[PDB]
UniProtKB/Swiss-Prot annotation, chain A:
Superkingdom in the source lineage: Bacteria
Gene name of this polypeptide: rplQ
Swiss-Prot/TrEMBL keywords: Ribonucleoprotein, Ribosomal protein
InterPro entries: Ribosomal_bL17, Ribosomal_bL17_CS, Ribosomal_bL17_sf
Name under which the protein is recorded: Large ribosomal subunit protein bL17
Species whose genome carries this gene: Escherichia coli O81 (strain ED1a)
PANTHER family per the UniProt record, alphabetical: LARGE RIBOSOMAL SUBUNIT PROTEIN BL17M, RIBOSOMAL PROTEIN L17
GO cellular component: cytosolic large ribosomal subunit
RNA sequence: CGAUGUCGGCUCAUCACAUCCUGGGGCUGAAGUAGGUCCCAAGGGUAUGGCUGUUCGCCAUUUAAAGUGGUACGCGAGCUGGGUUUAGAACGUCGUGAGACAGUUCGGUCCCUAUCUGCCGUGGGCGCUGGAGAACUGAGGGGGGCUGCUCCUAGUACGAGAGGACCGGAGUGGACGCAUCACUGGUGUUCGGGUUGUCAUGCCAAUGGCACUGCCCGGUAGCUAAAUGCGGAAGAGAUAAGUGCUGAAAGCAUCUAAGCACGAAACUUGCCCCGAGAUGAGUUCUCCCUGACCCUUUAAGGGUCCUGAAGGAACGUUGAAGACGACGACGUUGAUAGGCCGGGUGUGUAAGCGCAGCGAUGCGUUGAGCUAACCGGUACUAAUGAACCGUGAGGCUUAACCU
RNA sequence: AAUUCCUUGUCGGGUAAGUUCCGACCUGCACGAAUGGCGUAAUGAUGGCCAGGCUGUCUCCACCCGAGACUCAGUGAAAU
RNA sequence: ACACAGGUGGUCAGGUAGAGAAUACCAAGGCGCUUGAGAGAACUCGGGUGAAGGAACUAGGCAAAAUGGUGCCGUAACUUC
RNA sequence: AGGACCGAACCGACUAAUGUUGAAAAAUUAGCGGAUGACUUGUGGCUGGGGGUGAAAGGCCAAUCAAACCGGGAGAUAGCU
């Protein structure tokens, strides 16, 4: 069934998905572009964009809610100072999914998820 | 649940009728380098839609 | 959902007294006795409020002569008339289902007044 | 009379002054524009071929684009066909709107059901399950036996087994129409119609009511 | 949903405390009982000198269900506690005189006219 | 006997008619209601429990009725193992004894991923004669087919009373099936909140992890039922048992021999679904292609260059579609999905700070903060322009109209 | 009756209904006194039965979370 | 028989809560188990929750569900006391 | 004090499910009994095939027991296949 049940299970625990998408969102912000499969890319897109949505307004309250998620100040410091200002006027897609190829090991369709505006 | 009589080569081939592989055969040349690749996939060095998207 | 919400508006009545759940409501419903529209009364503590626009409903628990009666009320219906509030209460939960087991002097609430 | 194609857009309630909550279903019906008038003297039967809805210029294909331009109409999202029941002449390009339903009081809907997947025998055919305990191993929701023994030797054709439930054409009959909207182009039928929100409905007057 | 083996309370002045529905009268394979359906019960507990006694089998009518009864507006009169009223086995004629525990308007159907008339509320 | 596994129960059934109920009739020791009996009829329906391992049976309470059988007394490559025929033990009896018992009792391993046939669903190839895109007719087939009670007719007919209809027509239920979340509820480990233990975030504060989601209380969408709608039919044709008309053979009589008329839930339709692989491969509408040279045992032949159309497929973003294929929508000439914004719903008065208080904590800011797939908008991100397949007016014989 | 074939004996109690269960009568097919007879507090992963509680065992399942199943890449069996 | 969810004697054995070497969360130290990636059907297995009823299930309350600690009050028949 | 009580280690193995071409030629998960003794366990010995040992099942004696395994008599014999 799963009629209108937008969320992807990823063959894992729910306690694993909260920590996989926490550490993978963390390495996307520390770096600027990472490499993973599409089904993780289409889903990381659902977690990292609500952070760039969040850090457009700095406050003590917004730092906490951005610290419950991602659980590390370095990502919180990378947010609110870099990304918030760097994606200010744009209202929408703060990241880009880009298909590349496959892995030698398990043949998984991969993609380079990237934050937009990286022509520095 | 085992089997009763041995199947033939005929039955072994008719079953592998639909196991036959299929190629892509219709690639796209990029606007910049023209290196052939898959539709909606980056090149070997980082070109995509006539643009170095790997930025490296 | 535009054509439904615009159709949802035509049935809904524009005077419904809003309230927080936990208030001691006094509601009046039209009960028809043969051919006489008698105008009943019903008191009790509001248990839950299900806000869905026209499909709204709220549950009222009345300790009657018997064990205890709970009635729900389709808010925007031509049966319900009064949504008069008697005692504004102060509860933390949004829906008070634990009042189906607390009884008497244990099932009493606190007036809000703030 | 004939019938009409409409879009199922949700369902709600319309209260009576007696407080009787009437569960209605809203059927968006713009206008069935008639493309072809099929004839007994041409084909072998009388019927009209209607369409409704909106298309895209890059999406309407060449074969049908002429078929719409033969009579001359804005292209709709596919065609349908209603058989005439008596001598009921029309013209091509005629627009049959909802006002035909201002008279009939028992209607009939017909639409693709809500697809329910590969449904097992318990869901599909209402087979009583076996015991969850008391020894039962690996047969908790199994259909059990599927035939007699050597005398048939086979399974009869038409056995209730596990397969495709839903995503199939269903006709729910004799719904009572409630209100027939002219301006808003609606149709309120009492109850529920097949298929999810937005799925098409072939609405016709009740034929055996 | 009052069905077989359901332990109802008693809501009249006859004597019993706990009854148990042993058959839902009305039809073949009939699953449960509802608003004002006639059922066959047995008495599991009584008051000492009362009219009925333990181990007797007579009819009853449900009055207050824990699942509650739906009114035609989509409202429910969900009570809290299953209860019934004992009847004569051979006629309508309720054996009680003091029907306690407020009943529903959905019983007003001329064969239970005595029930609503003796009832306290609703 | 180089294996055919066994009673009962669960599950799933299916056919037969010597029919339990409903339907249509004859006869009656048939007044009426209710029955007895026989004939036609298999469309559908055809108990829940206490006791026994039991089928059966007895009993209690119903129901319109709780039919009789075939089907390895259907069903263990579907389940259970209670009973019974492995190994232990005891009692009664039999025997000197080992042991034995159509006597009994307590306990005691139920194996297998389906090649084929069959059946339930779903696709690929090719064919259908130029190809492609849509809409239907329709042979064949399947599903569905149950019924009570109350009321009106009328408390009339009938009956000394007691009692109490046929037929016809409304309303309200049970069982079963289809469909759907607007209502009432269920779940809702992607949402909010409370709290215990402990570790960590440098520490207070504030959070996160783990302990079945730690335990809980609620709850959006979706799914679904106990929830909410709907369904059986009416009518028609031809008939069964049966009832009559006219009417001879046989001056009469007589339903039958010629001819004619009524007559069942059965048969064929009417209702709904599948459906042109119905190779007897149908029909209608529309769209697209009307380029040049050689060889040849010169034939519906083969080859080359020039164009490769409609359309399809592939790929991509995905769907209330879905196991995989497939099917539907969309592909910037853009609303398909993600994001964002407004709204709604849910949870409930966040964080920080101020004040009161020794403190836990409360009040104020504030029905705020946070808000999952929900509703309506918006191209910010991704659906890149091409390429691949498919062609170039469509054979033979004959007839009928144009010329 | 771990014993009674007849037999579900008969009567009583428990239940709406009790081939089992408890008490009793005695026609003990075929109990019986150290192959011990009759009781017996406690004990028991013991046999039978009843009641309270409690719940998806059941009426009748519904949904959800994970591991296989299903698809793709690599390796690649078996009874027969 | 294998790089096999098995078997194998003795010793040391911290912090917080706790009666405890139970058990939970951590320290030091050592590991993520030598196939993975998607999809999110029936069905199977390990589990969660549940309207009304509550054994109606069944050979049988099998399995689940429930009870569950400390302090105190109170505690029957029978008995070898 | 106790062949005392609840309950880990340790020992044992009653119920259910899974597994039964299994992870395993008897185990795993959730429960369960004993748990200061007629206890359990390490190391080293002793008792042997018509014999050993046995809180006694005709159980155990190297995955084998109403008479172990290996070699020889032996190509036993077979009115049977
Ligand atoms: Mg996997
Ligand atoms: Mg967890
Ligand atoms: Mg294959
Ligand atoms: Mg097994
Ligand atoms: Mg008669
Ligand atoms: Mg039974
Ligand atoms: Mg029976
Ligand atoms: Mg069997
Ligand atoms: Mg077993
Ligand atoms: Mg046909
Ligand atoms: Mg038919
Ligand atoms: Mg008279
Ligand atoms: Mg009458
Ligand atoms: Mg709810
Ligand atoms: Mg919950
Ligand atoms: Mg939470
Ligand atoms: Mg702290
Ligand atoms: Mg940790
Ligand atoms: Mg717990
Ligand atoms: Mg809930
Ligand atoms: Mg042909
Ligand atoms: Mg296309
Ligand atoms: Mg636009
Ligand atoms: Mg979107
Ligand atoms: Mg506050
Ligand atoms: Mg918080
Ligand atoms: Mg929001
Ligand atoms: Mg007796
Ligand atoms: Mg004697
Ligand atoms: Mg003796
Ligand atoms: Mg002697
Ligand atoms: Mg003795
Ligand atoms: Mg004793
Ligand atoms: Mg013992
Ligand atoms: Mg019992
Ligand atoms: Mg593979
Ligand atoms: Mg290993
Ligand atoms: Mg090992
Ligand atoms: Mg410790
Ligand atoms: Mg460490
Ligand atoms: Mg699953
Ligand atoms: Mg549970
Ligand atoms: Mg147990
Ligand atoms: Mg438990
Ligand atoms: Mg232990
Ligand atoms: Mg020897
Ligand atoms: Mg010799």
């Amino acid at each position: 069934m799963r009629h209108r049940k937008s969320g992807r299970q990823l063959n894992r625990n729910s306690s694993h998905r909260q920590a996989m998408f926490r550490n993978m969102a963390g390495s996307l912000v520390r770096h600027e572009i990472i490499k993973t499969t599409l089904p993780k890319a289409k889903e990381l897109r659902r977690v990292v964009e609500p952070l760039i949505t969040l850090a457009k307004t700095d406050s003590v309250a917004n730092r906490r809610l951005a610290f419950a998620r991602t659980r590390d100040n370095e990502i919180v410091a990378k947010l609110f100072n870099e990304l918030g200002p760097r994606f200010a006027s744009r209202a929408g897609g703060y990241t880009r999914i880009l298909k590349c190829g496959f892995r030698a090991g398990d043949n998984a369709p991969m993609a380079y998820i990237e934050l937009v505006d990286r022509s520095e | 649940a085992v089997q009763q009589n041995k199947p033939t080569r005929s039955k072994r081939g008719m079953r592998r009728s639909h196991d036959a592989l299929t190629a892509v055969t219709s690639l796209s040349v990029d606007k910049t380098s023209g290196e052939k690749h898959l539709r909606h996939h980056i090149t070997a060095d980082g070109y995509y839609r006539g643009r170095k998207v790997i930025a490296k | 959902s535009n054509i439904i919400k615009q159709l949802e508006q035509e049935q809904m009545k524009q005077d419904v007294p809003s309230f927080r759940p936990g208030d001691t409501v006094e509601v009046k419903v039209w009960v028809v006795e043969g051919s006489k529209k008698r105008l009943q009364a019903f008191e009790g503590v509001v248990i839950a409020i299900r806000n869905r626009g026209l499909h709204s409903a709220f549950t009222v628990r009345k300790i009657s002569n018997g064990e205890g009666v709970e009635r729900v009320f389709q808010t925007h219906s031509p049966v319900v008339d009064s949504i008069s509030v008697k005692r504004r209460g102060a509860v933390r939960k949004a829906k008070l289902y634990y009042l189906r087991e607390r009884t008497g002097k244990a099932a009493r609430i606190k007036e809000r007044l703030n | 009379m004939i019938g009409l194609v409409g879009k199922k857009v949700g369902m709600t309630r319309i209260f009576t002054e007696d407080g009787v909550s009437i569960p209605v279903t809203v059927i968006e019906v713009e206008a069935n524009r008639v493309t072809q008038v099929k004839d007994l003297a041409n084909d072998g039967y009388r019927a009209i071929q209607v369409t409704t809805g909106a298309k895209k210029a890059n999406r309407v294909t060449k074969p049908e684009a002429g078929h719409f331009a033969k009579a001359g109409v804005e292209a709709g999202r596919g065609l349908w066909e209603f058989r005439l029941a008596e001598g009921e002449e029309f013209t091509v390009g005629q627009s049959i709107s909802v006002e035909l339903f201002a008279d009939v009081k028992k209607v009939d809907v017909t639409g693709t059901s809500k697809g329910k997947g590969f449904a097992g025998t318990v869901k599909r055919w209402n087979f009583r399950t076996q015991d969850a305990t008391h020894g039962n191993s690996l047969s908790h929701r199994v259909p059990g036996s599927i035939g007699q023994n050597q005398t048939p030797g086979k399974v009869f054709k038409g056995k209730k087994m596990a397969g495709q439930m839903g995503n199939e054409r269903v006709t729910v009959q004799s719904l009572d129409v409630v209100r027939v909207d002219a301006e808003r182009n609606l149709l309120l039928v009492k109850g529920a119609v097949p298929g999810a929100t937005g799925s098409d409905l072939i609405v016709k007057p009740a034929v055996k009511a | 949903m009052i069905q077989e083996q359901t332990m109802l309370n008693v809501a009249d002045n006859s004597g019993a405390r706990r009854v148990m529905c042993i058959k839902v009268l009305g039809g073949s394979h009939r699953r449960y009982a509802g608003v004002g359906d006639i059922i066959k019960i047995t008495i599991k507990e009584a008051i000492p000198r009362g009219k009925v006694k333990k181990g007797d089998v007579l009819k009853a009518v449900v009055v207050r269900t824990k699942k509650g009864v739906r009114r035609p507006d989509g409202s429910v009169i969900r009570f809290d506690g299953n209860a019934c009223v004992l009847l004569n086995n051979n006629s309508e004629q309720p054996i009680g005189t003091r029907i306690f525990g407020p009943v529903t308007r959905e019983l007003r159907s001329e064969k239970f006219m005595k029930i609503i008339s003796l009832a306290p509320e609703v």
